[PDB]
Design an enzyme around this catalytic site. Structure first.
Site, mmCIF file in Angstrom:
data_model
loop_
_atom_site.group_PDB
_atom_site.id
_atom_site.type_symbol
_atom_site.label_atom_id
_atom_site.label_comp_id
_atom_site.label_asym_id
_atom_site.label_seq_id
_atom_site.Cartn_x
_atom_site.Cartn_y
_atom_site.Cartn_z
ATOM 1 N N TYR A 170 0.861 -1.176 0.000
ATOM 2 C CA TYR A 170 0.000 0.000 0.000
ATOM 3 C C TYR A 170 0.897 1.225 0.000
ATOM 4 O O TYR A 170 2.068 1.153 0.426
ATOM 5 C CB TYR A 170 -0.934 -0.013 1.230
ATOM 6 C CG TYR A 170 -2.119 0.918 1.086
ATOM 7 C CD1 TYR A 170 -3.096 0.684 0.107
ATOM 8 C CD2 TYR A 170 -2.252 2.041 1.899
ATOM 9 C CE1 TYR A 170 -4.183 1.554 -0.042
ATOM 10 C CE2 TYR A 170 -3.363 2.921 1.749
ATOM 11 C CZ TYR A 170 -4.301 2.656 0.765
ATOM 12 O OH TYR A 170 -5.395 3.486 0.585
ATOM 13 N N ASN A 178 -20.740 -4.319 -7.866
ATOM 14 C CA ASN A 178 -21.379 -4.749 -6.628
ATOM 15 C C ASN A 178 -20.514 -4.458 -5.407
ATOM 16 O O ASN A 178 -20.921 -4.734 -4.286
ATOM 17 C CB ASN A 178 -21.686 -6.252 -6.686
ATOM 18 C CG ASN A 178 -22.600 -6.711 -5.569
ATOM 19 O OD1 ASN A 178 -23.641 -6.099 -5.301
ATOM 20 N ND2 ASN A 178 -22.219 -7.806 -4.913
ATOM 21 N N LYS A 200 -20.331 -6.825 4.060
ATOM 22 C CA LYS A 200 -19.216 -6.037 4.586
ATOM 23 C C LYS A 200 -19.081 -6.382 6.066
ATOM 24 O O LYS A 200 -20.074 -6.380 6.807
ATOM 25 C CB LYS A 200 -19.445 -4.527 4.382
ATOM 26 C CG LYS A 200 -18.460 -3.549 5.078
ATOM 27 C CD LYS A 200 -16.961 -3.681 4.688
ATOM 28 C CE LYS A 200 -16.666 -3.068 3.334
ATOM 29 N NZ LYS A 200 -15.263 -3.321 2.873
#
Lengths: 347, 347
Positions: free
Chosen positions: B68, B167, B342
């Site tokens: 990252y 989605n 989630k």
């Protein structure tokens, strides 16, 4: 026409019209034929020109193959670039006169022929005091080089630019124009036995650094930027892993501009580079630039480049003059992966 | 904390501090441990917060893995997104007060813990009249959606936008925000048995068209744009051939913005598309946007999104509430290729 003459005057007595014509898209070696054409009429705003010299360029080849963004209706005359002399003008023409030199205002005209009649608006007058080889190659490669250096990133003296295909016509023009702009060039070239001679030649044009694709992709490249700022602009014509390695050299927020390459070698961009380094990928198409801008805007570019040519700051790459009748060998030579001389058809 | 409560008030009596901490980069399942932390001191401009809920997001995972653009110093607390209640303020704090809800002003804070002391400038106050699930997920996904719709191409009602990963959290927010902007969305999703149910759900959010990756890449897609304008904006999070097929749908001069994806699936751009269609590729990194802009600019974005949430125009995706102690199962669930809910850590 002798391409290297210092006597920039030519006879234009009547002769048969001969043209390189293709009736189907395909392998240029197979589809392009030398044909005789009829003498065309000069309407009010038309001019008759006699072609002096016309290069064979990758875009000419791609057009004939049918893999190009502009495809003239068939049967078509080959060639998009070249320089011609005006020999006759229609009754309503006042902006060109016999003896003027002209190049096409945009692609699609069909330059591989001895003479033609074109609309006045299809042509741009160019100075006739520059070498024929320079006039013949003025309208494409150095224009593409200049535009990419000016139009994408704001660069000032001492900023760097990286490119690949540095020994190509565009690459050599980038070197020379960047040098005149006070820019510092990092010039990537394909690996080749006897790389020293090439490196010396590109340095003689003003190149600061010349490195091979292998040198570009090796770990040591991570240390390349001591004494040298990271480039905010990268110019690409190769694609594949080579294009990814160019991207890796850009400063955060930099742009890589792609102006050529092969079908099946797409440009490849890592997610990390797009996201965390905020890099931009763009294309550049000179023919679209010309379409989008006035003839006067193109002429202004031409004049700027001519000022450089007169001062010895923009010299043409090595060229071979080929009579139109000997086009077959020139086409074959132009399609090789390593072309040593630009092939320039003369008549 | 019960994530779905309509009673948006919580007790904050003293309890031990517990945090999900990693001491090395690696597989989140292996490197993340639940630890007790000492009670920290509140300096003049610090505030003490009690974390209410914190999602597990791909960026959290990539950070822990070490892949990252921002990597907090180790040992670090996991998590970048979440909503907390201010419980105490330092003597010089006047802009936050006990009972206020806050989210991080930018990434790197470490949200997967029960409570923390943060600088006041590290936090943004958010309204406390929106559902907890909405507050918990407000600061990343819908912000990324809104920014990409606003910052790259000027779009007006009736213009189209194409995206993949439709989605996903960002994809669902794009659908809803584009709908509120009067934009027409073309939403690409991965092929899956029982595609009908997914398509119905995305259409219930305002999606105009929902097509699979296979439908995107088949010849019939060439006829997709009768009754529908070509999009000038494409949003990508998949890369590879999927990203190339999104590019193919863009209008000339359009931009594809990449906001996620995998290492080893780079974005792939054909030379023809860059050059002849003059397409642009960009990245977008919300955390960089936040760094580059004021806290007030971020707050303004938050308030705009809250106006949508109150009107039922921006609803949260399906979520599963997971107590902090049960984090291991949540991390495992969040790393699957098809996540149905989630995962949201509560304390």
């Amino acid at each position: 026409v002798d391409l290297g003459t210092e006597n920039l005057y030519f006879q234009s007595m009547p002769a048969r019209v001969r043209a390189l014509v293709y009736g189907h898209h395909g392998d240029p070696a197979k589809v392009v034929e030398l044909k005789n054409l009829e003498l065309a009429a000069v309407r009010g705003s038309d001019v008759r020109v006699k072609m002096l010299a016309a290069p064979i360029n990758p875009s000419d080849i791609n057009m004939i193959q049918g893999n190009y963004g502009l495809l003239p209706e068939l049967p078509a005359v080959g060639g998009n670039e070249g320089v011609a002399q005006v020999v006759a003008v229609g009754s309503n023409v006042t902006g060109l006169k016999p003896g003027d030199w002209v190049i096409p205002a945009n692609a699609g005209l069909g330059t591989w022929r001895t003479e033609a009649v074109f609309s006045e608006e299809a042509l741009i007058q160019v100075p006739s005091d520059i070498p024929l080889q320079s006039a013949a190659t003025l309208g494409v490669n150095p224009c593409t080089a200049y535009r990419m250096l000016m139009d994408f990133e704001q660069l000032q003296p001492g900023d760097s630019v990286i490119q690949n295909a540095s020994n190509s016509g565009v690459g050599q023009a980038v070197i020379q124009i960047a040098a005149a702009l006070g820019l510092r060039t990092i010039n990537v070239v394909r690996d080749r036995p006897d790389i020293q001679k090439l490196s010396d030649r590109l340095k003689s044009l003003g190149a600061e650094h010349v490195i091979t694709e292998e040198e570009l992709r090796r770990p040591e490249m991570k240390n390349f930027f001591k004494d040298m700022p990271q480039p905010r602009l990268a110019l690409n014509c190769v694609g594949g892993k080579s294009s990814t390695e160019l991207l890796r050299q850009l400063a955060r927020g930099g742009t890589m501009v792609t102006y050529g390459g092969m079908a099946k070698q797409p440009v490849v961009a890592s997610v990390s580079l797009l996201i965390f380094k905020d890099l931009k990928l763009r294309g550049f198409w000179l023919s679209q630039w010309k379409k989008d801008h006035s003839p006067d805007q193109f002429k202004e570019l031409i004049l700027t480049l001519c000022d450089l040519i007169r001062r010895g700051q923009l010299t043409a790459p090595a060229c071979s003059q080929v009579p139109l009748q000997d086009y077959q060998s020139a086409l074959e030579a132009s399609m090789k992966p390593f072309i040593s001389s630009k092939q320039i058809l003369t008549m």
